[PDB]
Design a protein around this ligand. Structure first.
Ligand SMILES: [K+]
Ligand SMILES: [K+]
Ligand SMILES: [Mg+2]
Ligand SMILES: [Mg+2]
Ligand SMILES: [Mg+2]
Ligand SMILES: [Mg+2]
Ligand SMILES: [Mg+2]
Ligand SMILES: [Mg+2]
Ligand SMILES: [Mg+2]
Ligand SMILES: [Mg+2]
Ligand SMILES: [Mg+2]
Ligand SMILES: [Mg+2]
Ligand SMILES: [Zn+2]
Lengths: 25, 81, 150, 96, 87, 121, 97, 206, 217, 129
RNA sequence: AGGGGAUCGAAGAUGAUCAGAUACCGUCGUAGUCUUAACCAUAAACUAUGCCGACUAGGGAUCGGGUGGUGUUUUUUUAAUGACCCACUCGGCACCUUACGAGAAAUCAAAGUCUUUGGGUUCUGGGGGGAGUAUGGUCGCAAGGCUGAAACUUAAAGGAAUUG
RNA sequence: AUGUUU
């Protein structure tokens, strides 16, 4: 995969992880 | 080349080199005795004078500052010492 | 060179090899000293004193003619300023830049130049404090910069 | 210069820079972090006893063939489960 | 390079360039040896009698062999007003 | 096309390089001695070689051509000399018995030679 | 590797150059990189010059020219053959043909 | 060290000035030529014909030092000097190379070629660069007729002269041959003008 | 026979030049291997390696064979020849020819005192070919040749008996390593030591001393 | 800025020697430079050199004779013990028979041979061979 | 968050192609594009070449300043500047040739003055992935920025160049 | 203008 699109997919994954972690406490 | 007299370069070459890049650095400027419209003194004026030098006992301009050497008001005489 | 720039300019004065007064110079050492004191009492800094001396008179270097530097002559005759000449002009430049910044507030270039000028001021003041020219507690303050030069 | 301080009084910076850059070596980093003790089921030991859990046929990677007849073994020391190859022609009948 | 009891143990004491004093190597094929025939009694170019100059391949490659040979010849005679120490 | 190949051109060239005091510029007598001074294995090739030799001989009499050196080009090169004889080497003529040079050339001459007719103007 | 000794553009000591749009495809290309060709054509190209000189009411009209600077991107210049792929040594030749 | 007979006489001095050897290259000149007399306006430089004569004499002595005359090879690919080198190798025993040098003449010992000179003289170093390169491959000293803008690389003896003028080129080659013959002994006295005129070396277009 | 060309070869056949030291002194270019054969009769050769070089062309694998050959007697002389040919035997023979043509002198010296028959090099020397750098350091007696097998073979064919070697770069490139070692060996006579400072009278070349050996009668 | 005038002088000398020049102008030509040049001249690696006394720090013109393979400084000026002089000579010089490691010692600037026959040591300054 | 919002235009809507084409192409078109006041601090933020200092080839252009000329041209009334030419010089953007030299080579007046290794100094890298991920800290309104592993996995990945 | 895998 293009490195830019790998970075974008990783950023989306990081955002999803941040959301799922924030929902827990 | 590979062989030359670094201690006795030609006077033409030394006059061609930059004032700092000569064998021993020295000023290429000088002083002039400007013939004043008055008397009692001959004013000494730097060649690269940054000032608009006036006569010692008068108010006439002897030179006008420029980037390098100064002007001479277009009426003057000047001895080069 | 150009401590706060990319320039490599070498333009500077190339004083003559001779440490003695020129032959064509006939004015007395006491006379040129007296003219130096007259200019200083008229309020000229050593730089402008030397400029006038070499432009309108024939004195080439006050050190080679009178055996003493202009600032040293002024200090010996009690005309030395509170702060050195170069520091005073650096502070004045900083004051001008800051006064322009107050009225512009968008000149990021002026802000950058003010930072450069103030860094130069602080380094020069550190040197002067080290050599005890300024008091050891001397501090340059932007809020009091103008009151020190006017 | 060569990109490093040469000054006679720069020994502190030289040794600190060397200390920082030694972390990029695998052996040094593993030794200083003690990776073998935590990871590496053999807890920094050459050999380890275990109890055989299962005979498995692990197919060799390309371009090869000939599944290798390994065994899943639970180590007595720490209970971790590892796979061990049984090297000889046969010799899987020699383990149960 | 001699040994104890002072006998030459080294082969091929090499020649040296007359302009740079560096060794002319055996594989220095850009180097040149120049013989200038001696003149006796208004010419006649006595054969087998020369003034000999060695010029290194480095000098010849740098294109200073002409100036160096002018200087060396004028130093040895052979030339009167070509090369000047000041320039 | 009627372009001649190597085996014709080179053979004709060699035939000239070794048989110049020999066969003239007529093909009929050029092909005859080819049989005795060359072992050609086909009459068509012999005719081709003889024809190119004839052409080369016909164009050799009007100026030497490249790659033909039969030990007579040097003799003719020595015989043909002195294009413009008996008039001058461009010395002491074409002027008022002087050299029309510049002032800087005048100083060049006065450096060492004080005896030279100069018309520096 | 680095194909061109300076770059595929002309920018040294500049840093940034404002872009221009390719006349063929409208691609944004820096002005120093765009291929620039001046087209100075007769209004009547070659064939109807005689017809327009005949139909003209003015003797010796001296018909005008159309001037147009064309800025091309690299892809469009190569496709339209304003410039062509050159040999490695021929690339180091800035003189126009 | 050379006796008084070897200095530049007025006859060959005015010969050089007539053939325009002193008209050197334009204001652009290789910065390895101290043979330059002060530059005249219109760009043309003045070559010191005295230095030209002394360099010519030194080159002549170097040629005379060669034991076998055929070991001297004179090279000129330019048309202006082909006849000059042919005359030089006709008078002296040198080996001529007029026109193409056939690169590989000093290396590459294949026939029709492969002379082994002990000295090579070239009319123009720029047009005969290949010969100079091969000489630097096989240790061959080089004399070159060099203008003020001629390359000095692998040029052991430069003779400063106008290499644009056919008269200057032919006269320089003629003087080289004459001095070589005088040193060898073919010309018993070096005071006679060597009656055979220096037009045998000039090129002829018609 | 020989029937020489390249008049240096004619002189060598005629026996006017009897040692290769004169050729080295006058930097005479050598073009025939028979000169080296007649001047160094005891010149033993060794094939360092033969490797196939392949050119891809229309199913490819042109697969020519390149041979590296080191020739030399173990007294002061080595040559290195690298040559490619269609066949291994021809590549080896042409490599031997090229190595003989490339034979150069080596300057042996003393590590310590002047006890005769020098055993080491006069100075440290470095040669570089490709990325490989080979440095030869003088070593005390009995050290041997501390070098990799190929460089050690080249040095022992050069006659060095005690030397240290240091190598940098991809030394597994045997051709580059051997060329670098050859350059380092050759630099021994290009390094100017104080014991070579004394001026020499610049002797006359044998091509001038015996000049009547270039003609065709 | 300028940090070692001796380093600048020796680098200029190296560049002139390796370009084949027989003379080299070095500035500002300090006393350490003068002493180093005097050691090189005493050991015959350089010829006559002129100190040009401008009323600045000065200049020097050195005459080179082509016997200098390499001159260089060791920066920093490492302290060298008598036992470490041998290690420095082994590292820097091409051979044990020639070449000189130059030290600044309290007995003066001198080559390692003079230093070890005076039984003195100090700081390493450079090398010449 | 205000103002402005012509044009183009992430999104979205659509027409056509395609096997599918909510892609390329076409028509609209929101945010944006513009500006003020605050954030953000990231780019192939590139010359993929840190900064200061010295030295080592040649050359012609060009920008700015200066110096000189029996200089050409412009008028004020001697001259002067203005523009231009020639030469030199300092500083700058670069360029051409050659490289003693350097490099793996492409190429490089620096990427040279390095095994003949040391002018001063800052930062960064240690096979390829995992991974600029997890975690902690910190900054941000957010998007994210800075700092940053490990387990595990792999014999290559990669650079330049050659021939097909 | 387009034409998918090995
Ligand atoms: K298999
Ligand atoms: K809008
Ligand atoms: Mg500076
Ligand atoms: Mg700074
Ligand atoms: Mg590519
Ligand atoms: Mg940018
Ligand atoms: Mg499409
Ligand atoms: Mg970044
Ligand atoms: Mg970067
Ligand atoms: Mg890694
Ligand atoms: Mg690749
Ligand atoms: Mg497949
Ligand atoms: Zn386009």
């Amino acid at each position: 995969m293009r490195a830019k699109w790998r970075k974008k997919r990783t950023r989306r994954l990081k955002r999803k992880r941040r959301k799922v972690r924030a929902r827990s406490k | 080349v590979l062989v030359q007299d670094l201690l006795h370069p030609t006077a033409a070459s030394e006059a061609r080199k930059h004032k700092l890049k000569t064998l021993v650095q020295g000023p290429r400027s000088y002083f002039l005795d400007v013939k004043c419209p008055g008397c009692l003194n001959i004013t000494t004026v730097f060649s690269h004078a940054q000032t608009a030098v006036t006569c010692e006992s008068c108010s006439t301009i002897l030179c006008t500052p420029t980037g390098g050497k100064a002007k001479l008001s277009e009426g003057t005489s000047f001895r080069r010492k | 060179g150009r401590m706060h720039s990319a320039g490599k300019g070498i333009s500077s004065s190339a004083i003559p090899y001779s440490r003695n007064a020129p032959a064509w110079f006939k004015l007395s050492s006491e006379s040129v000293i007296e003219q130096i004191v007259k200019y200083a009492r008229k309020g000229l800094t050593p730089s402008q004193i030397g400029v006038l001396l070499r432009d309108a008179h024939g004195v080439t270097q006050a050190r080679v003619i009178t055996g003493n530097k202009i600032m040293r002559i002024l200090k010996s005759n009690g005309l030395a300023p509170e702060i050195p000449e170069d520091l005073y002009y650096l502070i004045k430049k900083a004051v001008s830049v800051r006064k322009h910044l107050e009225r512009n507030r968008k000149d990021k270039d002026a802000k950058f130049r003010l930072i450069l000028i103030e860094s130069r001021i602080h380094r020069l003041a550190r040197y002067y404090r080290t050599v005890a020219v300024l008091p050891p507690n001397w501090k340059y303050e932007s809020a009091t910069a103008s009151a020190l030069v006017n | 210069g060569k990109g490093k301080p040469r000054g006679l009084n720069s020994a502190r910076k030289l040794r600190v820079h060397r200390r920082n850059n030694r972390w990029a070596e695998n052996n040094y980093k593993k030794r200083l972090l003690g990776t073998a003790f935590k990871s590496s089921p053999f807890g920094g030991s050459s050999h380890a006893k275990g109890i055989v859990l299962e005979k498995l046929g692990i197919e060799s990677k390309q371009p090869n063939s000939a599944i290798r007849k390994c065994v899943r073994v639970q180590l007595i020391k720490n209970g971790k489960k590892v796979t061990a190859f049984v090297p000889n022609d046969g010799c899987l009948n020699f383990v149960d | 390079m001699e040994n104890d009891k002072g006998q030459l143990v080294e082969l091929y004491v090499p020649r040296k360039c007359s302009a740079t004093n560096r060794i002319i190597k055996a594989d220095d094929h850009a180097s040149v040896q120049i013989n200038v025939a001696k003149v006796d009694e208004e010419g006649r170019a006595i054969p087998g009698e020369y003034v000999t100059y060695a010029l290194s391949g480095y000098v010849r490659s740098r294109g200073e062999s002409d100036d160096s040979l002018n200087r060396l010849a004028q130093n040895d005679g052979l030339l009167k007003n070509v090369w000047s120490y000041s320039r | 096309g009627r372009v001649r190949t190597k085996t014709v051109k080179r053979a004709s060239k060699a035939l000239i390089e070794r048989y110049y005091p020999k066969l003239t510029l007529d093909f009929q007598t050029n092909k005859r001695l080819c049989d005795e001074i060359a072992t050609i294995q086909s009459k068509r090739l012999r005719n081709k070689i003889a024809g190119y030799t004839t052409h080369l001989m016909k164009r050799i009499q009007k100026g030497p051509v490249r790659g033909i050196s039969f030990k007579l080009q040097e003799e003719e090169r020595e015989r043909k000399d002195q294009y413009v004889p008996e008039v001058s080497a461009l010395d002491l003529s074409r002027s008022n018995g002087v050299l029309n040079v510049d002032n800087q050339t005048s100083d060049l001459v006065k450096s060492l030679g004080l005896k030279l007719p100069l018309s520096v103007i | 590797p680095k194909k061109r000794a300076s770059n595929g553009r002309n920018k040294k000591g500049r840093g940034h150059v404002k872009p221009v749009r390719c006349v063929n495809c409208s691609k944004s290309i820096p002005k120093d990189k765009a291929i620039k060709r001046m087209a100075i054509r007769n209004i009547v190209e070659a064939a109807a010059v005689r017809d327009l000189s005949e139909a003209s009411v003015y003797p010796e009209y001296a018909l005008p020219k159309t001037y147009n600077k064309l800025h091309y991107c690299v892809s469009c210049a190569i496709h339209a053959r304003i410039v062509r792929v050159r040999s490695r040594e021929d690339r180091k030749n800035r003189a126009p043909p | 060290s050379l006796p008084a007979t070897f200095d530049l006489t007025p006859e060959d001095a005015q010969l050089l000035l007539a053939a325009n050897t002193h008209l050197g290259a334009r204001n652009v000149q290789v910065h390895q030529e101290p043979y330059v007399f002060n530059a005249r306006p219109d760009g043309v430089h003045v070559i010191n014909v005295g230095k030209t004569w002394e360099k010519l004499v030194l080159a002549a002595r170097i040629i005379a030092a060669i034991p076998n005359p055929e070991d001297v090879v004179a090279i000129s690919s330019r048309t202006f000097g082909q006849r000059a080198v042919l005359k030089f190798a006709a008078h002296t025993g040198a080996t001529p190379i007029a026109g193409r040098f056939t690169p590989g003449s000093f290396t590459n010992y294949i026939t029709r070629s492969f002379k082994e000179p002990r000295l090579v003289i070239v009319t123009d170093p720029r047009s005969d660069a290949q010969a100079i390169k091969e000489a630097s491959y096989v240790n061959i000293p080089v004399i070159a007729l060099t203008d003020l803008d001629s390359p000095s690389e692998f040029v052991d003896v430069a003779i400063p002269c106008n290499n644009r003028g056919k008269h200057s080129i032919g006269l320089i080659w003629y003087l080289l041959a004459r001095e070589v013959l005088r040193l060898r002994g073919a010309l018993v006295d070096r005071t006679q003008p060597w009656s055979i005129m220096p037009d045998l070396y000039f090129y002829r277009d018609p | 026979g020989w029937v020489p060309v390249t008049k240096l070869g004619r002189l060598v056949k005629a026996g006017k030049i009897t040692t290769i030291e004169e050729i080295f002194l006058h930097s005479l270019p050598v073009k025939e291997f028979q000169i080296i054969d007649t001047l160094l009769p005891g010149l033993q050769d060794e094939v360092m390696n033969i490797k196939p070089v392949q050119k891809q062309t229309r199913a490819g694998q042109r697969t020519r064979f390149k041979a590296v050959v080191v020739v030399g007697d173990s007294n002061g002389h080595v040559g290195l020849g690298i040559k490619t040919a269609k066949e291994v035997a021809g590549a080896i023979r042409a490599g031997i020819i090229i190595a003989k043509l490339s034979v150069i002198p080596i300057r042996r010296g003393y590590w310590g005192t002047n006890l005769g028959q020098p055993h080491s090099l006069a100075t440290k020397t470095t040669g570089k070919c490709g990325s490989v750098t080979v440095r030869l350091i003088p070593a005390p007696r009995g050290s041997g040749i501390v070098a990799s097998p190929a460089v050690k073979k080249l040095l022992q064919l050069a006659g060095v008996e005690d030397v240290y070697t240091q190598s940098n770069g991809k030394t597994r490139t045997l051709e580059n390593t051997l060329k670098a070692a050859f350059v380092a060996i050759g630099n021994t006579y290009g390094f100017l030591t104080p014991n070579l400072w004394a001026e020499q009278p610049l002797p006359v070349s044998p091509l001038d001393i015996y000049s009547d050996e270039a003609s065709a009668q | 800025t300028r940090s070692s005038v001796l380093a600048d002088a020796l680098n200029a000398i190296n560049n002139a020697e390796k370009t084949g020049k027989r003379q080299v102008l070095i500035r500002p030509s300090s006393k350490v430079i003068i002493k180093f040049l005097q050691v090189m001249q005493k050991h015959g690696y350089i010829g006559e050199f002129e100190y040009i006394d401008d009323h600045r720090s000065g200049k020097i013109v050195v005459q080179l004779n082509g016997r200098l393979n390499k001159c260089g400084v060791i920066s920093p000026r490492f302290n060298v013990k008598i036992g470490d002089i041998e290690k420095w000579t082994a590292n820097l010089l091409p051979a044990r028979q020639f070449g000189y490691v130059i030290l600044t010692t309290s007995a003066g600037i001198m080559d390692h041979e003079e230093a070890r026959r005076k039984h003195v040591s100090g700081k390493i300054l450079g090398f010449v061979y």
